[PDB]
Amino acid sequence: EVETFAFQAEIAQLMSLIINTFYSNKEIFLRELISNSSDALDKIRYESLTDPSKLDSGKELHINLIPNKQDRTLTIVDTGIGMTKADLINNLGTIAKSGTKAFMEALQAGADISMIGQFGVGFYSAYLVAEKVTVITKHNDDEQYAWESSAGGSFTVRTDTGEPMGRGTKVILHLKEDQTEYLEERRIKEIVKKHSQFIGYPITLFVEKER
Numbered sequence: 001e002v003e004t005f006a007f008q009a010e011i012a013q014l015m016s017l018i019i020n021t022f023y024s025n026k027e028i029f030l031r032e033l034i035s036n037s038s039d040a041l042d043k044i045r046y047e048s049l050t051d052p053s054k055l056d057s058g059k060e061l062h063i064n065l066i067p068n069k070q071d072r073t074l075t076i077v078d079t080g081i082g083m084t085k086a087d088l089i090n091n092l093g094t095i096a097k098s099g100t101k102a103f104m105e106a107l108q109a110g111a112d113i114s115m116i117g118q119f120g121v122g123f124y125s126a127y128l129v130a131e132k133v134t135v136i137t138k139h140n141d142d143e144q145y146a147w148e149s150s151a152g153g154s155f156t157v158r159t160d161t162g163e164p165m166g167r168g169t170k171v172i173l174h175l176k177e178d179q180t181e182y183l184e185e186r187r188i189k190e191i192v193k194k195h196s197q198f199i200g201y202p203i204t205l206f207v208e209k210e211r
Protein backbone atom coordinates (compact mmCIF):
# COMPACT_ATOMS: atom_id res chain seq x y z
CA GLU A 1 0.00 0.00 0.00
CA VAL A 2 3.05 2.34 0.28
CA GLU A 3 5.20 2.50 -2.84
CA THR A 4 8.78 3.75 -2.56
CA PHE A 5 10.52 5.36 -5.55
CA ALA A 6 14.06 6.55 -6.18
CA PHE A 7 14.58 10.13 -7.24
CA GLN A 8 16.23 10.49 -10.61
CA ALA A 9 19.93 11.02 -10.02
CA GLU A 10 20.01 14.70 -10.97
CA ILE A 11 17.01 15.45 -8.74
CA ALA A 12 18.72 13.68 -5.85
CA GLN A 13 21.78 15.81 -6.56
CA LEU A 14 19.72 18.99 -6.58
CA MET A 15 18.05 18.11 -3.28
CA SER A 16 21.49 17.49 -1.70
CA LEU A 17 22.72 20.84 -2.94
CA ILE A 18 19.66 22.63 -1.51
CA ILE A 19 20.11 20.86 1.80
CA ASN A 20 23.85 21.30 2.17
CA THR A 21 24.66 24.67 0.60
CA PHE A 22 25.07 27.62 2.93
CA TYR A 23 22.38 30.07 1.83
CA SER A 24 20.68 32.46 4.24
CA ASN A 25 17.82 33.75 1.96
CA LYS A 26 15.65 30.71 2.71
CA GLU A 27 12.34 32.63 2.62
CA ILE A 28 12.11 32.20 -1.17
CA PHE A 29 10.67 28.70 -0.61
CA LEU A 30 7.32 30.30 0.16
CA ARG A 31 7.31 32.38 -3.01
CA GLU A 32 8.05 29.25 -5.04
CA LEU A 33 5.23 27.20 -3.49
CA ILE A 34 2.71 30.04 -3.82
CA SER A 35 3.79 30.37 -7.46
CA ASN A 36 3.21 26.66 -8.05
CA SER A 37 -0.24 26.98 -6.44
CA SER A 38 -1.04 29.96 -8.65
CA ASP A 39 -0.04 27.95 -11.76
CA ALA A 40 -2.26 25.04 -10.67
CA LEU A 41 -5.16 27.45 -10.06
CA ASP A 42 -4.59 28.99 -13.51
CA LYS A 43 -4.80 25.48 -15.01
CA ILE A 44 -8.14 24.47 -13.47
CA ARG A 45 -9.56 27.90 -14.31
CA TYR A 46 -8.47 27.44 -17.96
CA GLU A 47 -9.88 23.92 -18.20
CA SER A 48 -13.17 25.13 -16.66
CA LEU A 49 -13.66 27.61 -19.53
CA THR A 50 -14.63 24.84 -21.94
CA ASP A 51 -15.83 22.32 -19.30
CA PRO A 52 -17.51 23.91 -16.25
CA SER A 53 -18.22 20.56 -14.62
CA LYS A 54 -14.52 20.48 -13.78
CA LEU A 55 -15.45 22.85 -10.91
CA ASP A 56 -17.99 20.35 -9.51
CA SER A 57 -15.18 19.42 -7.05
CA GLY A 58 -15.10 23.01 -5.80
CA LYS A 59 -15.68 26.43 -7.28
CA GLU A 60 -13.46 28.53 -4.96
CA LEU A 61 -9.95 29.19 -6.26
CA HIS A 62 -7.71 30.15 -3.36
CA ILE A 63 -4.49 29.58 -1.40
CA ASN A 64 -4.40 29.10 2.38
CA LEU A 65 -1.27 29.28 4.58
CA ILE A 66 -1.66 27.36 7.81
CA PRO A 67 1.06 27.45 10.48
CA ASN A 68 0.93 24.96 13.35
CA LYS A 69 3.46 25.67 16.10
CA GLN A 70 2.56 22.49 18.02
CA ASP A 71 3.32 20.17 15.09
CA ARG A 72 6.04 22.53 13.75
CA THR A 73 4.45 22.45 10.31
CA LEU A 74 3.64 25.10 7.71
CA THR A 75 0.92 23.93 5.33
CA ILE A 76 0.16 25.54 1.96
CA VAL A 77 -3.16 24.44 0.48
CA ASP A 78 -4.65 25.37 -2.87
CA THR A 79 -7.72 24.41 -4.80
CA GLY A 80 -5.95 24.18 -8.14
CA ILE A 81 -5.99 21.38 -10.72
CA GLY A 82 -4.26 18.87 -8.39
CA MET A 83 -2.19 15.90 -9.50
CA THR A 84 -2.97 12.35 -10.58
CA LYS A 85 -0.82 9.51 -9.24
CA ALA A 86 1.04 9.53 -12.59
CA ASP A 87 1.53 13.30 -12.24
CA LEU A 88 3.15 12.77 -8.83
CA ILE A 89 5.47 10.01 -9.95
CA ASN A 90 6.38 11.58 -13.30
CA ASN A 91 6.79 15.21 -12.27
CA LEU A 92 7.73 14.98 -8.58
CA GLY A 93 10.82 12.89 -8.72
CA THR A 94 11.35 10.11 -11.24
CA ILE A 95 11.94 12.16 -14.42
CA ALA A 96 14.99 14.31 -15.32
CA LYS A 97 13.80 17.83 -16.08
CA SER A 98 16.31 19.55 -18.37
CA GLY A 99 15.93 22.45 -15.91
CA THR A 100 17.51 20.41 -13.12
CA LYS A 101 20.91 20.16 -14.78
CA ALA A 102 20.60 23.66 -16.24
CA PHE A 103 20.05 25.07 -12.75
CA MET A 104 22.99 23.27 -11.21
CA GLU A 105 25.16 24.45 -14.11
CA ALA A 106 23.89 28.02 -13.60
CA LEU A 107 24.82 27.75 -9.92
CA GLN A 108 28.28 26.61 -11.05
CA ALA A 109 28.52 29.80 -13.16
CA GLY A 110 27.60 32.08 -10.24
CA ALA A 111 23.77 32.09 -10.30
CA ASP A 112 21.77 32.37 -7.07
CA ILE A 113 19.59 29.66 -5.51
CA SER A 114 16.71 32.16 -5.61
CA MET A 115 16.62 31.70 -9.41
CA ILE A 116 15.43 28.09 -8.95
CA GLY A 117 11.90 28.76 -10.13
CA GLN A 118 13.11 29.77 -13.59
CA PHE A 119 14.23 26.17 -14.04
CA GLY A 120 10.88 24.56 -13.14
CA VAL A 121 12.15 22.95 -9.96
CA GLY A 122 11.13 25.61 -7.43
CA PHE A 123 9.25 23.00 -5.34
CA TYR A 124 12.55 21.56 -4.11
CA SER A 125 13.39 24.85 -2.38
CA ALA A 126 11.05 23.52 0.32
CA TYR A 127 14.09 21.57 1.56
CA LEU A 128 15.77 24.86 2.51
CA VAL A 129 13.49 24.92 5.55
CA ALA A 130 11.82 21.47 5.84
CA GLU A 131 13.32 18.21 7.01
CA LYS A 132 10.36 16.36 5.49
CA VAL A 133 7.69 17.40 2.97
CA THR A 134 4.29 15.75 2.54
CA VAL A 135 2.24 16.57 -0.55
CA ILE A 136 -1.48 15.57 -0.47
CA THR A 137 -3.23 15.96 -3.81
CA LYS A 138 -6.55 15.35 -5.53
CA HIS A 139 -7.14 15.67 -9.29
CA ASN A 140 -10.61 15.30 -10.87
CA ASP A 141 -9.39 12.20 -12.79
CA ASP A 142 -7.93 10.21 -9.84
CA GLU A 143 -8.19 9.47 -6.12
CA GLN A 144 -6.46 11.38 -3.31
CA TYR A 145 -2.74 10.55 -2.92
CA ALA A 146 0.04 11.40 -0.45
CA TRP A 147 3.62 11.91 -1.63
CA GLU A 148 6.32 12.23 1.04
CA SER A 149 10.09 12.59 1.20
CA SER A 150 12.80 13.38 3.73
CA ALA A 151 15.33 13.48 0.85
CA GLY A 152 17.96 10.81 1.14
CA GLY A 153 17.27 9.69 -2.43
CA SER A 154 13.71 8.36 -2.20
CA PHE A 155 10.06 9.33 -1.86
CA THR A 156 6.86 7.43 -1.14
CA VAL A 157 3.39 7.54 -2.68
CA ARG A 158 0.30 6.05 -1.08
CA THR A 159 -3.45 6.46 -1.33
CA ASP A 160 -4.41 9.09 1.23
CA THR A 161 -7.01 8.31 3.92
CA GLY A 162 -7.10 11.73 5.61
CA GLU A 163 -9.65 14.51 5.27
CA PRO A 164 -10.91 14.53 1.64
CA MET A 165 -9.80 17.67 -0.17
CA GLY A 166 -12.22 18.00 -3.04
CA ARG A 167 -9.57 19.09 -5.52
CA GLY A 168 -6.15 20.67 -5.26
CA THR A 169 -2.81 20.22 -3.51
CA LYS A 170 -1.66 20.60 0.09
CA VAL A 171 2.05 20.93 0.84
CA ILE A 172 2.95 20.17 4.47
CA LEU A 173 6.42 21.45 5.47
CA HIS A 174 7.80 19.66 8.54
CA LEU A 175 10.15 22.43 9.51
CA LYS A 176 13.73 22.06 10.68
CA GLU A 177 14.33 22.93 14.31
CA ASP A 178 16.05 26.23 13.54
CA GLN A 179 13.51 27.34 10.90
CA THR A 180 10.49 28.07 13.16
CA GLU A 181 10.41 31.77 12.17
CA TYR A 182 8.25 30.59 9.26
CA LEU A 183 5.43 29.76 11.74
CA GLU A 184 5.22 33.39 12.90
CA GLU A 185 2.35 35.46 11.56
CA ARG A 186 4.47 38.60 11.13
CA ARG A 187 7.20 36.70 9.29
CA ILE A 188 4.84 35.01 6.83
CA LYS A 189 3.02 38.27 6.14
CA GLU A 190 6.34 39.97 5.43
CA ILE A 191 7.33 37.27 2.95
CA VAL A 192 4.00 37.25 1.12
CA LYS A 193 4.01 41.05 0.81
CA LYS A 194 7.57 41.11 -0.50
CA HIS A 195 7.36 38.27 -3.01
CA SER A 196 3.75 37.39 -3.77
CA GLN A 197 2.08 40.80 -3.95
CA PHE A 198 0.64 40.21 -7.47
CA ILE A 199 -0.68 36.64 -7.12
CA GLY A 200 -4.18 36.72 -8.58
CA TYR A 201 -5.91 34.48 -6.05
CA PRO A 202 -6.79 35.27 -2.44
CA ILE A 203 -4.06 34.19 -0.01
CA THR A 204 -5.39 33.71 3.50
CA LEU A 205 -2.91 33.44 6.38
CA PHE A 206 -4.53 31.45 9.20
CA VAL A 207 -3.67 32.41 12.75
CA GLU A 208 -3.24 30.43 15.95
CA LYS A 209 -4.22 31.40 19.48
CA GLU A 210 -1.08 31.80 21.59
CA ARG A 211 0.10 28.58 23.32
Ligand SMILES: CCc1c(O)cc(O)c(C(=O)c2ccc(OCCN3CCOCC3)c(OC)c2)c1CC(=O)N(CCOC)CCOC
Nearest residue numbers: 033036037039040078080082083087091120121123169171
Ligand atom coordinates in the same frame (compact mmCIF):
# COMPACT_ATOMS: atom_id res chain seq x y z
C1 LIG B 1 4.41 20.14 -5.09
C2 LIG B 1 4.55 21.40 -6.03
C3 LIG B 1 3.13 21.90 -6.27
C4 LIG B 1 2.63 22.86 -5.37
O1 LIG B 1 3.46 23.37 -4.42
C5 LIG B 1 1.31 23.32 -5.48
C6 LIG B 1 0.55 22.72 -6.51
O2 LIG B 1 -0.78 23.10 -6.65
C7 LIG B 1 1.02 21.75 -7.40
C8 LIG B 1 0.09 21.20 -8.44
O3 LIG B 1 -0.84 20.51 -8.10
C9 LIG B 1 0.31 21.50 -9.90
C10 LIG B 1 -0.39 20.75 -10.83
C11 LIG B 1 -0.20 20.99 -12.19
C12 LIG B 1 0.69 21.99 -12.57
O4 LIG B 1 0.93 22.29 -13.95
C13 LIG B 1 0.44 21.32 -14.90
C14 LIG B 1 0.97 21.67 -16.35
N1 LIG B 1 2.31 21.83 -16.40
C15 LIG B 1 2.66 22.06 -17.65
C16 LIG B 1 4.17 22.27 -17.81
O5 LIG B 1 4.93 21.20 -17.29
C17 LIG B 1 4.49 20.83 -16.00
C18 LIG B 1 2.95 20.78 -15.90
C19 LIG B 1 1.39 22.73 -11.62
O6 LIG B 1 2.32 23.71 -12.07
C20 LIG B 1 3.17 24.28 -11.08
C21 LIG B 1 1.25 22.48 -10.26
C22 LIG B 1 2.37 21.36 -7.28
C23 LIG B 1 2.96 20.33 -8.26
C24 LIG B 1 4.03 21.12 -9.12
O7 LIG B 1 4.36 22.28 -8.98
N2 LIG B 1 4.66 20.36 -10.18
C25 LIG B 1 5.66 21.05 -11.00
C26 LIG B 1 7.01 20.28 -10.90
O8 LIG B 1 7.57 20.52 -9.64
C27 LIG B 1 8.90 20.03 -9.48
C28 LIG B 1 4.23 18.96 -10.39
C29 LIG B 1 3.25 19.10 -11.58
O9 LIG B 1 2.86 17.87 -12.12
C30 LIG B 1 1.76 18.01 -13.00
